[PDB]
Design a protein around this nucleic acid. Structure first.
Lengths: 86, 149, 129, 217
RNA sequence: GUAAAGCGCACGCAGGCGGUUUGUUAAGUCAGAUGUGAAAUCCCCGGGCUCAACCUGGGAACUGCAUCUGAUACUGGCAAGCUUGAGUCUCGUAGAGGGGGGUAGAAUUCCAGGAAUACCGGUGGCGAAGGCGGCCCCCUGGACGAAGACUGACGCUCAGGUGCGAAAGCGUGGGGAGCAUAGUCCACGCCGUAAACGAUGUCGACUUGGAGGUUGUGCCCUUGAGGCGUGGCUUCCGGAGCUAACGCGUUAAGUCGACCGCCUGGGGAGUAC
């Protein structure tokens, strides 16, 4: 969720060490943590409180993808290749 | 010497256990025709004694205001607590194209060439407060140049 | 500032004209050096010193002659989204011309006399009185 | 100066209109400095004598308790005025009808300076001493007066700020001594000296009074 | 904020709006002319009816649009950057944020069990609001602090739009004590309603303050219950300023900037179609 499996996914995308909040490393950490949280909303199906917190970061997932879109068309396609998006 | 002028007189009542005791108000201004102006306020239980006591109220607390050519020179806006007064400087020979209470304060200053307007409320107690604040805020070209440099 | 650097500066200065502090300070872009190098020269304030190189920032010295404070009624007019690009033969004279009218000309910001001397107006920055 | 003796009183609860004149706090109280006040301990004497050379009148408005004798120390022996007790509303701005309240008095002084107080037999003269107790209390340095006070001197700005509110109202210069927690912006000739501590209040009133006999010149 | 008027509340699409440095283009805009804006009215000097209306010579003005030349300070598209707006990580901290699962008494009618806190319980405390209080674990939600680290404007706002939506009512499927004879209670579907009233959109930056709340955590004989700071939100009285007053008053309604909702006399009326 936050500590263990994030620590094995951090260096899978960084252009060097500790570049953590770069936009490549950003979304791939985040989109991963929408699939796994959707396992939690694969059931329980009445938590309308927390569901906006999911709905929060799903829109921000598309927000930073605009920042790949407007700057570098190449690196945009490279990670949605590696994630299979849209 | 000086120069008086009234404004109005009301029909101010009151209520005691007995009945309805009346009174009367008297709004006046005093300004010598050279730039200094003042105003007052005073009541009574009849008409002519109210004026007599309010007239001395204005013969003190006359505030220092400088003029330029029997007129104003730069457009101050005046506002005091119920009403907005918009004074634009104008040409010589123009009369004081003005409404109510500020006519009384401008033909006592020495002001004679101003077009101006009351913008909002038309209640002559609170109108006459504003234009005295309007002439208080002003600055002559001496007050311009000596203050900045 | 968030969404105008020059408007939100003009709140910061004349709040010093309501408690009479000595020195005022705002985070200072290179435009902001060119602001108070007009207010000093026309005489409305006295002295300023830029400092900082990762936070370039000013030390403006105020000017209150008495209990009265010198910078009386400064007003920004051209606020973002309401640009008023004045042609020069419309020009705002401030308080019958007795103040100054800071106009963003080509040749600089320093503007009393763009009416005749320079000869080209532009966007008003702020009236000054 | 002599203010190694007098430095501090008036604990922490304060007004932040008194920002410049405070030097700085020290153990839950502030210290009255010298640097902004030692000028005004003799900038005042540049204005004492020239106002006094107008044949002046300096009302020592002193309605504190410690200033009972401590304001008449060398006040009228130097030929000035004082009120070391209760205060009439408007001893400047309402003074002309306070003289009307001496029109009640100085014709009844004729009962005392003559022997004609024996009239109005003594059951009447029981109650008549009760004004004679109290008329000469608040009217001390005003019977010798013949005019408006040519200057103004409030000693403390937390007790008689009722008086200062009427004193600044009609434009007479004031040689005040304000406190650390005041509303100071009425007295336009202002001193943040120690206006507590009865030992120190003599150290300004006697300091002025050595010269004002020569003030009239 | 109470005078008609802040959608009950949330993310957001098209819209509107830019931190910070350099380069550059010249559309925005400024400047210069050259075209052109029909004449007649309006306007200023001048003529003619015995004056005036009226007729009239020349000017100015017609605020306009299109083109060349110029200008680079602001703004705007392209290019390149820097750290404070924002944002991810580490790391702890406090908590009626929920969802499910069973649990189960300080208590309580019938012959079994329906209910839900006594205490803590409060000016506490959570959350976008309606709200939510037994206890433990389970999947999840937000905020906070102490440092580092790197991303280099990536943001703020919102018409429609789509969700979450106090009671009841109603639907279909049961129950029946506390006690209103279904319904109230769980549940699957409609229904979106209200004092859904901080009768106070949102974010940002600035300005006299004073005392209490609560959560931290740096320094300091921590030598302690404790001081100076220093975070965050919430109280209580009050300066200047403001407001029709009443009042607000560092959590604003005060000085502002960007953006959205809404009102323009009462009744008929939240009604006719």
């Amino acid at each position: 969720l936050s500590t263990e499996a994030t620590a094995k996914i951090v260096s899978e995308f960084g252009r060097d060490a500790n570049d953590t909040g770069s936009t490549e490393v950003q979304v791939a950490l985040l989109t991963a943590q929408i699939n796994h949280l959707q396992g939690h909303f694969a059931e329980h199906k009445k938590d309308h409180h927390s569901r906006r917190g999911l709905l929060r970061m799903v829109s921000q997932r598309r927000k930073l993808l605009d920042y790949l879109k407007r700057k570098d068309v190449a690196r945009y396609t490279r990670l949605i290749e590696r994630l299979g998006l849209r | 010497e000086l120069q008086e002028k009234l404004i109005a007189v009301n029909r101010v009542s009151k209520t005691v256990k007995g009945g309805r005791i009346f009174s009367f108000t008297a709004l006046t201004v005093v300004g010598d025709g050279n730039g200094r102006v003042g105003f007052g306020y005073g009541k009574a239980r009849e008409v002519p004694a109210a004026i007599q006591k309010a007239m001395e109220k204005a013969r003190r607390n006359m505030i220092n205001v400088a003029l330029n050519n029997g007129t104003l020179q730069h457009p101050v806006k005046g506002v005091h607590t119920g009403s907005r007064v918009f004074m634009q400087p104008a040409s010589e020979g123009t009369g004081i194209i003005a409404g109510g209470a500020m006519r009384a304060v401008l033909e006592v200053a020495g002001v004679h060439n101003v077009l101006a307007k009351a913008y909002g409320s038309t209640n002559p107690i609170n109108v006459v407060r504003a234009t005295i604040d309007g002439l208080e805020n002003m600055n002559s070209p001496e007050m311009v140049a000596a203050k900045r440099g | 500032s968030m969404q105008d650097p020059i408007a939100d500066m003009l709140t910061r200065i004349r709040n010093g004209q309501a408690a009479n502090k000595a020195a005022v300070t705002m985070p200072s872009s290179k435009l902001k050096v060119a602001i108070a190098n007009v207010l000093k020269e026309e005489g409305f304030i006295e002295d300023f010193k830029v400092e900082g190189d990762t936070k370039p920032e000013l030390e403006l010295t105020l000017k209150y002659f008495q209990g009265k404070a010198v910078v009386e009624s400064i007003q920004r007019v051209s606020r973002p989204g309401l640009r008023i690009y004045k042609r020069k033969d419309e020009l705002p004279k401030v308080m019958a011309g007795l103040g100054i009218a800071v106009v963003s000309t080509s040749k600089g910001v320093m503007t009393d006399r763009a009416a005749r001397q320079a000869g080209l107006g532009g966007e008003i920055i702020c009236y000054v009185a | 100066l002599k203010a190694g003796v007098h430095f501090g009183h008036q604990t922490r609860y304060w007004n932040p209109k008194m920002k410049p004149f405070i030097f700085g706090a020290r153990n839950k109280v502030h210290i009255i400095n010298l640097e902004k006040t030692v000028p005004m301990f003799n900038e005042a004497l540049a204005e004492l004598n020239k106002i006094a050379s107008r044949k002046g009148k300096i009302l020592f408005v002193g309605t504190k308790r410690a200033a009972s004798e401590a304001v008449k120390d060398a006040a009228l022996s130097c030929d000035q005025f004082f009120v070391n007790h209760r205060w009439l509303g408007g001893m400047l701005t309402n003074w002309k009808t306070v003289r009307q309240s001496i029109k009640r008095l100085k014709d009844l002084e004729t009962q005392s300076q003559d022997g004609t107080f024996d009239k109005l037999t003594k059951k009447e003269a029981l109650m008549r001493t009760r004004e004679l107790e109290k008329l000469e209390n608040s009217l001390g340095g005003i019977k010798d007066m013949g005019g408006l006070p040519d200057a103004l001197f409030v000693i403390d700005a937390d007790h008689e700020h009722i008086a200062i509110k009427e004193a600044n109202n009609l434009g007479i210069p004031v040689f005040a001594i304000v406190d650390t927690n005041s509303d100071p912006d009425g007295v336009d000739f202002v001193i943040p000296g120690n206006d507590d501590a009865i030992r120190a209040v003599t150290l300004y009133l006697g300091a002025v009074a050595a010269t004002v006999r020569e003030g009239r010149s």
